[PDB]
Amino acid sequence: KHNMKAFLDELKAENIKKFLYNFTQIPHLAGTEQNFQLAKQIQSQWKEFGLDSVELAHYDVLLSYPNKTHPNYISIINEDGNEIFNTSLFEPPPPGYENVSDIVPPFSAFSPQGMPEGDLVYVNYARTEDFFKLERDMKINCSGKIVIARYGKVFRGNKVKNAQLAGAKGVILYSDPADYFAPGVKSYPDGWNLPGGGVQRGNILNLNGAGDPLTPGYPANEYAYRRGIAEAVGLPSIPVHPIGYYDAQKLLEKMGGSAPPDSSWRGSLKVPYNVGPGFTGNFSTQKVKMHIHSTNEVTRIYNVIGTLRGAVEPDRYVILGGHRDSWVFGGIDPQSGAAVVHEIVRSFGTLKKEGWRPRRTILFASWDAMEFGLLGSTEWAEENSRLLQERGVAYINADSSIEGNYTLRVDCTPLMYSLVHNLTKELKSPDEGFEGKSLYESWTKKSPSPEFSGMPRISKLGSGNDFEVFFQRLGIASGRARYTKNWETGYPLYHSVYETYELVEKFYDPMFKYHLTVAQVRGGMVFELANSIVLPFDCRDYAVVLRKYADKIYSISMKHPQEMKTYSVSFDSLFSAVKNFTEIASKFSERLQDFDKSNPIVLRMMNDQLMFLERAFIDPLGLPDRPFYRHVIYAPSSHNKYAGESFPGIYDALFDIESKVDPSKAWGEVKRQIYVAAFTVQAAAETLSEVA
Amino acid sequence: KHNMKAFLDELKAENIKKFLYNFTQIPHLAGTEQNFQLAKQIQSQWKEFGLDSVELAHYDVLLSYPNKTHPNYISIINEDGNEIFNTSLFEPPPPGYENVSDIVPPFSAFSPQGMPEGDLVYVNYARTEDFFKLERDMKINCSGKIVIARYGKVFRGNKVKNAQLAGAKGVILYSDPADYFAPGVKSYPDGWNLPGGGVQRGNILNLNGAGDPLTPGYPANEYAYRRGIAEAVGLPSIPVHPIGYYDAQKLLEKMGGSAPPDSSWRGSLKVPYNVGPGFTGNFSTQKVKMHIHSTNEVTRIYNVIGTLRGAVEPDRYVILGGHRDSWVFGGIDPQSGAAVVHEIVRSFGTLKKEGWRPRRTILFASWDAMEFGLLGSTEWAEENSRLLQERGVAYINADSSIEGNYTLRVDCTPLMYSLVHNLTKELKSPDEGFEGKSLYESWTKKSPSPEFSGMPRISKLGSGNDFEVFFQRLGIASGRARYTKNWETGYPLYHSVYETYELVEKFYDPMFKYHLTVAQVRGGMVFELANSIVLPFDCRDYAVVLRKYADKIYSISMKHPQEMKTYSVSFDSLFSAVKNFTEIASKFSERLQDFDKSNPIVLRMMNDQLMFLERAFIDPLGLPDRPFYRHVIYAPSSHNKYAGESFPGIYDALFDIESKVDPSKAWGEVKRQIYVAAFTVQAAAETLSEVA
Numbered sequence A, B: 001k002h003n004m005k006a007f008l009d010e011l012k013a014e015n016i017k018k019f020l021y022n023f024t025q026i027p028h029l030a031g032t033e034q035n036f037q038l039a040k041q042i043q044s045q046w047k048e049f050g051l052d053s054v055e056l057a058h059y060d061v062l063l064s065y066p067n068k069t070h071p072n073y074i075s076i077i078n079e080d081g082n083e084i085f086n087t088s089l090f091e092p093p094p095p096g097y098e099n100v101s102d103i104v105p106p107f108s109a110f111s112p113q114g115m116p117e118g119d120l121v122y123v124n125y126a127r128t129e130d131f132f133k134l135e136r137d138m139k140i141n142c143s144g145k146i147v148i149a150r151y152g153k154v155f156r157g158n159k160v161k162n163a164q165l166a167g168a169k170g171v172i173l174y175s176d177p178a179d180y181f182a183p184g185v186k187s188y189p190d191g192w193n194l195p196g197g198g199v200q201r202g203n204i205l206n207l208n209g210a211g212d213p214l215t216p217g218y219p220a221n222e223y224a225y226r227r228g229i230a231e232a233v234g235l236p237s238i239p240v241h242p243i244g245y246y247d248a249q250k251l252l253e254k255m256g257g258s259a260p261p262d263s264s265w266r267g268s269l270k271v272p273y274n275v276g277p278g279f280t281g282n283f284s285t286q287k288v289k290m291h292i293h294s295t296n297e298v299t300r301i302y303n304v305i306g307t308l309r310g311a312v313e314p315d316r317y318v319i320l321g322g323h324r325d326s327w328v329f330g331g332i333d334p335q336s337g338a339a340v341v342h343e344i345v346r347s348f349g350t351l352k353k354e355g356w357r358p359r360r361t362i363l364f365a366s367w368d369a370m371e372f373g374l375l376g377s378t379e380w381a382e383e384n385s386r387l388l389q390e391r392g393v394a395y396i397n398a399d400s401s402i403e404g405n406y407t408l409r410v411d412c413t414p415l416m417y418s419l420v421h422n423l424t425k426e427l428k429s430p431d432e433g434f435e436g437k438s439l440y441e442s443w444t445k446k447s448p449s450p451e452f453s454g455m456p457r458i459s460k461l462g463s464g465n466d467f468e469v470f471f472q473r474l475g476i477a478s479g480r481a482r483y484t485k486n487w488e489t490g491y492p493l494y495h496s497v498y499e500t501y502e503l504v505e506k507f508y509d510p511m512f513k514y515h516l517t518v519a520q521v522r523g524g525m526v527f528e529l530a531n532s533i534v535l536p537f538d539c540r541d542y543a544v545v546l547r548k549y550a551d552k553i554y555s556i557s558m559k560h561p562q563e564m565k566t567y568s569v570s571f572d573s574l575f576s577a578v579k580n581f582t583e584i585a586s587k588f589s590e591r592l593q594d595f596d597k598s599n600p601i602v603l604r605m606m607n608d609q610l611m612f613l614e615r616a617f618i619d620p621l622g623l624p625d626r627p628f629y630r631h632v633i634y635a636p637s638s639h640n641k642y643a644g645e646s647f648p649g650i651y652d653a654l655f656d657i658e659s660k661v662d663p664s665k666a667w668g669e670v671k672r673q674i675y676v677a678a679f680t681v682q683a684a685a686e687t688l689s690e691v692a
């Protein structure tokens, strides 16, 4: 039989292992020849695996690279201007790769050039609340200072934005062992911990969903008109560079000025964690000097797009996509995901060769330049936006398959909660102590829902991955799944040269059983979405979460009862819309289960109602000053791109409102956001009403 | 049989006459009790006629009314401040209506209050080119002057915007007999000409598609947050008032300063048409003083929405809509259209009572507050935007059925050209000298295509009517049809108290045969759109017009050959996209005619490709500073809302470019608009490619 069981049984751990090894022997940095060669390889293999068509979609986008003959580094300088300490020019390469060419040294992609000299201020994680504490409570002024911040907690672009708005003239990012060194585990290559010479790469853009900085709204094709750099979206205005903790120790050890305000500001290095500004009395005349010479360059990138045409609804698209470009070897990020996608294509192709076709079209994507701002997925979606918004059923992401070996982690739209519960009940747990038990059972046990006994945790989609354009801009139901660590006990070698095949094979998943389980979850989800007669979405699950989010946003507002009285701030409209959504979704579910099952139009009709429900939460005017974040329920946090925020428009209107100079205007805007949210929820509910 | 013939034969001239009489006995001004009563009447009658549901959709929108106890008027004042001439406080009411209550006196809706005193400048039609001539050629300065402008040529809101930007402190609008008095025809009530005491009402907003000035983007429902007046969209900043030509004679006769620059600046009054500024030497110390006391008020409006549920595709909507609100009696505008809609509903209801149903759902709308800025249609479409953009097949407008008795006038999307040609070949010409011949034959003879021998003229959609939100904001295929005058030989009594049932019955259409013909065209179009198995759109007709528009915009640019060389301005991408559109549409047409006719999915698929083709020309970012004009091919002219402009983004980038101070920046923006247009055309073409 050709059913989901046939598809799932065909997936093999050993194939994922072979593919991972194959994709991780050399660096695949976006815009390089090596990454074009791998694109062409994947194109060829997807054809052989049996897809109907496989094309490269290329774009010319702004990328960023260090100058090979003018290295980036940081110095301590004395009053003579002698550089008495210099940070490393590269990470010590791992065993057996000390002769690999074209390893890009650690840098912050899209940093401007500069050689700023100044006194250091230590800003903890450089979060919004960290700068509030510095400025408001401690009365420390970052204006004209170089800030040093530890990685962690929030996306690094938000740290740089926060540092900029505090008036910093430069940012040094470093990995603190408190955040990137698990107690009792050995450093690479003897364990999975970050060594002191390890450094996390990564872009520091604030794109807010725009894609290529030079072509917001439109694909960066051959005839594109590009903005000048001065008008580009999202570029930092101050120099930025990342370092490891050996180097960070040398910059922090001399820090004077104020003491850390409390213990949440101290990492694990043998230093005081003084906030500064500047060094202690003896070294008070030494300063920190950055040297950044990286250049921004328009460079060609290549997405691989494979199509498996649907037998019945060829004009309905289920998309499985993840990126291919890596900072260096990409042993976890992204090749642990890409190898899983490759094995999924191979399985689907096996069934197709035997005469099977999915009901709906499946599109498979190998995205480029994800590490430089989600550029490949975003430019392709800008090119194909009309096809995607009228035909896109769902998008399943496929970055790193593993970030630990403890349990499953799923982030998705509420529309997929039921699908995920049902699929995981069918799958075998790969976990020790759960042999012969379902993935649902092990997952629920290890990651209980905070709300419901007997169910597992499923999180909101945030951002920082290739689902962003599909979900937050276009309103296509999206989901992701991977294996994760026990958060009670990211990963230490994230975006370092040490992320290698050997890291995965030795320390994370020697038997490739977690990879296989993630292939089963991602592939199983795609199979159902592409093959179920009725789309496998449950609108009632959206109604439940909308009430939770309405309760939450109301509670935030109600911390200001006087102002709500003074400005007549009511949430009644939003609760009314949520109540209506609950009632209409209940009735729609009855019709879906009860409609005449022989009628394909009532079924195309009701499948269209299911497909366009996520779409209904899109506001074509976007959120304030963020035109490409259009989903009214979910946006990336304005304080942390990685985190999702619910009712983001109301949330941002309320954030720090007690500090606004004109409360009447501020609370007016809260009321405006309540109106927009209530309207959008009611409008989405009405898409599920009887159509005429 | 239940076919289009059955539908068409059921329509009766005598019923349209009875309905017109019924709808025109009392004024139906938006926001008044009389207009609510008529809404309730139409709701009741549409139910009795047999529609499945008929509801009122109400909104609370900004309207504008004169102060009943503080009348608007204009004076000439002497240096003592005696008012030696005053304009009329009302139009002399027509015979038999001198006792009708609640006739709103002539006013310019949305004028601010004020009593500005100054010297007059005469600005011809107050068009962009008229102000260019005043300022650039004649060196006349309007700053701090009261401008007097004759109605005609362009929408009055554009005149007021132009006057404002010239620094005018007030605007007087008047009807010149050159533009509103046909030679050899008698004034009302003895003929169809405007008498000297007649005045044209009308709003002077510049909404650019926004709808209610206080709630752009969102319906003005019960919980709406409204902008303050200071932030409202589209309101004029200087006082404005309309007058007739008896009064205009008194204001113009004393005008001094410069002579008219040529004969195109002189109307038909016995005055010099001096541009001013100010009066001749003897009267040089007299000034003009406006007194405007109208108030803006949020007021409830009511749309009637009737539904005839489709038998096969209930989730596909064909909409027939036109407005119900009038300035006074609405004898032509809009009741000649509303009576036609009423008879169309009655016919459809007759077939429905006999057991018939259309294939797709038909929605019928009686819009409110159209005269105050398309407010009723726009607020309803804002409320229902998600349903309309995923389910809207087509919108057929139904304002005034007649503006003359000469021949047919059709403005529509190219997608409907074939439908209109084929339907009119089936219909009987009502014209004298064409008995027994088709409407197509009489129409082609009297209104030949400027491009193609043997075919009739069909114009682009402009704006200024209720199709605007559906077509230019949401991208739903739209059309309109009415009987019109011979443009070789609008209508004189437009928006005056003299627009009555008697005007129509005596002078325009005594036998109601032109009304019946227009009912046949509008109803026939709705019938086909709602009933044809394959939607009756021909994508190849879009390809033909896109090449015409590309040629036209290229020609405009090529008036600047040096600059095109200097800034490397190429139209190659746009011609390439148009060529591709032509090729793909040709192949799609072959599949449509050749596909397996027994396959309803290939048919729903290909019907969806046809429905979403107009949708593909929408840019979600809108046009520059006009977020609600989103169609890249068609926008209302930025110089005249009534006129359509093709490739509006490129057109506006090129307009008056030789006057821009920074040519590099100006031509950069031309290139950006070429990129956006070429991309959008290619993207629309790709929606017609095979789907997978």
Ligand SMILES: *[C@@H]1O[C@H](CO)[C@@H](O[C@@H]2O[C@H](CO)[C@@H](O[C@@H]3O[C@H](CO[C@H]4O[C@H](CO)[C@@H](O)[C@H](O)[C@@H]4O)[C@@H](O)[C@H](O[C@H]4O[C@H](CO)[C@@H](O)[C@H](O)[C@@H]4O)[C@@H]3O)[C@H](O)[C@H]2NC(C)=O)[C@H](O)[C@H]1NC(C)=O
Residues within 6 Å of the ligand: A573, A574, A576, A577, A580, A678, A679, A682, B055, B056, B057, B058, B222, B223
């Ligand atoms: C959740 O779902 C419910 C429906 O189950 C919606 O209920 C609607 O709520 C609105 C209030 O926001 C009601 O609006 C009121 O309508 C009255 C007229 O309604 C009748 O006629 C209309 C046609 O015009 C029909 O649509 C309707 O079926 C009724 O037959 C108005 O008279 C009311 O205005 C008066 O009172 C208010 C309040 O004091 C004043 O501000 C006004 O000045 C005026 O005096 C009012 O506008 C509406 O009738 C309800 N529809 C129903 C019950 O079907 C909720 O709105 C929805 N929630 C959201 C967020 O959309």
Ligand SMILES: *[C@@H]1O[C@H](CO)[C@@H](O[C@@H]2O[C@H](CO)[C@@H](O[C@@H]3O[C@H](CO[C@H]4O[C@H](CO)[C@@H](O)[C@H](O)[C@@H]4O)[C@@H](O)[C@H](O[C@H]4O[C@H](CO)[C@@H](O)[C@H](O)[C@@H]4O)[C@@H]3O)[C@H](O)[C@H]2NC(C)=O)[C@H](O)[C@H]1NC(C)=O
Residues within 6 Å of the ligand: A055, A056, A057, A058, A222, A223, B573, B574, B576, B577, B580, B678, B679, B682
């Ligand atoms: C109208 O329809 C036609 C298709 O019939 C489109 O034609 C495309 O035109 C673009 C130019 O805008 C061509 O782009 C060129 O692609 C080359 C690679 O193409 C091959 O491989 C790709 C995958 O990456 C496949 O998609 C494709 O099928 C080919 O197999 C590039 O090498 C070219 O770049 C080089 O030359 C240019 C020009 O000098 C330089 O600027 C670059 O630096 C580089 O050296 C170029 O990008 C594309 O191949 C054409 N596709 C075809 C023929 O199928 C038109 O674009 C379309 N019109 C519009 C407005 O969309």
Ligand SMILES: *[C@@H]1O[C@H](CO)[C@@H](O[C@@H]2O[C@H](CO)[C@@H](O[C@@H]3O[C@H](CO)[C@@H](O)[C@H](O[C@H]4O[C@H](CO)[C@@H](O)[C@H](O)[C@@H]4O)[C@@H]3O)[C@H](O)[C@H]2NC(C)=O)[C@H](O)[C@H]1NC(C)=O
Residues within 6 Å of the ligand: A418, A419, A422, A536, A537, A538, A593, A594, A595, A597
């Ligand atoms: C995840 O799995 C759960 C559990 O299987 C699943 O919920 C179940 O879905 C089925 C199918 O819709 C439900 O069965 C329906 O029950 C009602 C009431 O008993 C019946 O009226 C329905 O009968 C109609 O449809 C049948 C075909 O399904 C026809 O055979 C019949 O002639 C009728 O037309 C129907 O049997 C069942 O109640 C639920 N169980 C629950 C909710 O506990 C859920 O849908 C899955 N989630 C997905 C797929 O996303």
Ligand SMILES: *[C@@H]1O[C@H](CO)[C@@H](O[C@@H]2O[C@H](CO)[C@@H](O[C@@H]3O[C@H](CO)[C@@H](O)[C@H](O[C@H]4O[C@H](CO)[C@@H](O)[C@H](O)[C@@H]4O)[C@@H]3O)[C@H](O)[C@H]2NC(C)=O)[C@H](O)[C@H]1NC(C)=O
Residues within 6 Å of the ligand: B418, B419, B422, B536, B537, B538, B593, B594, B595, B597
């Ligand atoms: C306006 O009217 C014109 C004139 O009637 C109309 O164009 C015509 O449309 C018909 C129907 O599509 C065309 O007929 C087709 O001709 C091709 C080539 O000869 C045939 O291959 C097609 O046959 C297929 O489809 C038939 C059903 O229509 C089946 O019976 C058959 O088995 C095949 O599947 C088909 O007969 C005809 O060529 C044109 N005439 C022209 C273009 O001159 C136009 O569509 C109308 N516009 C509308 C409705 O908007």
Ligand SMILES: *[C@@H]1O[C@H](CO)[C@@H](O[C@@H]2O[C@H](CO)[C@@H](O)[C@H](O)[C@H]2NC(C)=O)[C@H](O)[C@H]1NC(C)=O
Residues within 6 Å of the ligand: A022, A025, A040, A041, A044, A045
């Ligand atoms: C990854 O696997 C691919 C596919 O097997 C290898 O590419 C093949 O290389 C052989 C030998 O050079 C060629 O004959 C084939 O034409 C290639 N197939 C392709 C590109 O489709 C590739 O060598 C492997 N990479 C590594 C690093 O081992």
Ligand SMILES: *[C@@H]1O[C@H](CO)[C@@H](O[C@@H]2O[C@H](CO)[C@@H](O)[C@H](O)[C@H]2NC(C)=O)[C@H](O)[C@H]1NC(C)=O
Residues within 6 Å of the ligand: A067, A068, A069, A070, A295
């Ligand atoms: C990268 O840095 C190198 C080395 O400093 C730069 O190459 C020099 O450029 C200057 C002019 O800008 C020349 O006068 C030198 O002769 C060059 N030196 C070498 C070693 O080639 C180069 O400008 C930088 N590359 C960039 C900005 O991409």
Ligand SMILES: *[C@@H]1O[C@H](CO)[C@@H](O[C@@H]2O[C@H](CO)[C@@H](O)[C@H](O)[C@H]2NC(C)=O)[C@H](O)[C@H]1NC(C)=O
Residues within 6 Å of the ligand: A075, A081, A082, A083, A084, A085, A086
């Ligand atoms: C840090 O690196 C800098 C730059 O390479 C070193 O300073 C240079 O040293 C050479 C020879 O001693 C001088 O000729 C250059 O003029 C110096 N350049 C600058 C910018 O200072 C410095 O010696 C290094 N410091 C350490 C501790 O190795």
Ligand SMILES: *[C@@H]1O[C@H](CO)[C@@H](O[C@@H]2O[C@H](CO)[C@@H](O)[C@H](O)[C@H]2NC(C)=O)[C@H](O)[C@H]1NC(C)=O
Residues within 6 Å of the ligand: A141, A142, A143, A144
């Ligand atoms: C932090 O220090 C800078 C000075 O280095 C302050 O920035 C000044 O702001 C005032 C106006 O508010 C201007 O007159 C100065 O020109 C600014 N200085 C420069 C050179 O930019 C800033 O106000 C301080 N932050 C505090 C304590 O609020």
Ligand SMILES: *[C@@H]1O[C@H](CO)[C@@H](O[C@@H]2O[C@H](CO)[C@@H](O)[C@H](O)[C@H]2NC(C)=O)[C@H](O)[C@H]1NC(C)=O
Residues within 6 Å of the ligand: B022, B025, B040, B041, B044, B045
């Ligand atoms: C327009 O026609 C309507 C419908 O016939 C008339 O309204 C009817 O009036 C009669 C007598 O007052 C009532 O018995 C009916 O209930 C009304 N029908 C409705 C409102 O549906 C109306 O009087 C006519 N208007 C004019 C000006 O003649």
Ligand SMILES: *[C@@H]1O[C@H](CO)[C@@H](O[C@@H]2O[C@H](CO)[C@@H](O)[C@H](O)[C@H]2NC(C)=O)[C@H](O)[C@H]1NC(C)=O
Residues within 6 Å of the ligand: B067, B068, B069, B070, B295
């Ligand atoms: C319309 O004009 C009338 C008449 O001038 C205004 O009514 C007067 O309002 C003032 C205060 O604004 C009172 O002191 C007078 O007693 C009122 N007179 C009358 C005749 O009632 C009224 O303000 C205006 N209405 C509006 C603005 O809608």
Ligand SMILES: *[C@@H]1O[C@H](CO)[C@@H](O[C@@H]2O[C@H](CO)[C@@H](O)[C@H](O)[C@H]2NC(C)=O)[C@H](O)[C@H]1NC(C)=O
Residues within 6 Å of the ligand: B075, B081, B082, B083, B084, B085, B086
């Ligand atoms: C034009 O109308 C104005 C306002 O009604 C008239 O001027 C008023 O006349 C009365 C009595 O003569 C005075 O008490 C008022 O003070 C006047 N008001 C103003 C604002 O001037 C004027 O007489 C009328 N002119 C003509 C030609 O009839």
Ligand SMILES: *[C@@H]1O[C@H](CO)[C@@H](O[C@@H]2O[C@H](CO)[C@@H](O)[C@H](O)[C@H]2NC(C)=O)[C@H](O)[C@H]1NC(C)=O
Residues within 6 Å of the ligand: B141, B142, B143, B144
């Ligand atoms: C038309 O006349 C007005 C003066 O009445 C001019 O407007 C002035 O513009 C200059 C700056 O360009 C300012 O200094 C004045 O304050 C403005 N006047 C007022 C009172 O607004 C205008 O420039 C003239 N137009 C021409 C001839 O270009």
Ligand SMILES: O=C(O)CC[C@H](NS(=O)(=O)N[C@@H](CCC(=O)O)C(=O)O)C(=O)O
Residues within 6 Å of the ligand: A202, A203, A333, A370, A371, A372, A373, A374, A399, A400, A463, A464, A465, A490, A641, A642
């Ligand atoms: O540019 C972006 O939006 C992010 C690009 C890249 N995305 S990622 O894959 O490396 N981010 C993690 C987020 C880490 C976490 O929150 O656990 C992920 O999605 O796995 C980065 O953060 O540099």
Ligand SMILES: O=C(O)CC[C@H](NS(=O)(=O)N[C@@H](CCC(=O)O)C(=O)O)C(=O)O
Residues within 6 Å of the ligand: B202, B203, B333, B370, B371, B372, B373, B374, B399, B400, B463, B464, B465, B490, B641, B642
């Ligand atoms: O607010 C608007 O956009 C226009 C409202 C109203 N529309 S209209 O129906 O009166 N305009 C005419 C345009 C007259 C013409 O161009 O022949 C029409 O569409 O018939 C008006 O112009 O005041």
Ligand SMILES: *[C@@H]1O[C@H](CO)[C@@H](O)[C@H](O)[C@H]1NC(C)=O
Residues within 6 Å of the ligand: A192, A404, A405, A406, A485, A507, A508
């Ligand atoms: C793999 O699982 C074991 C058992 O809990 C754990 O001790 C080890 O740290 C895990 N490896 C990684 C890389 O998380």
Ligand SMILES: *[C@@H]1O[C@H](CO)[C@@H](O)[C@H](O)[C@H]1NC(C)=O
Residues within 6 Å of the ligand: B192, B404, B405, B406, B485, B507, B508
């Ligand atoms: C009606 O048609 C006749 C014949 O051409 C024409 O003379 C007359 O002016 C028309 N009436 C109107 C109102 O246009």
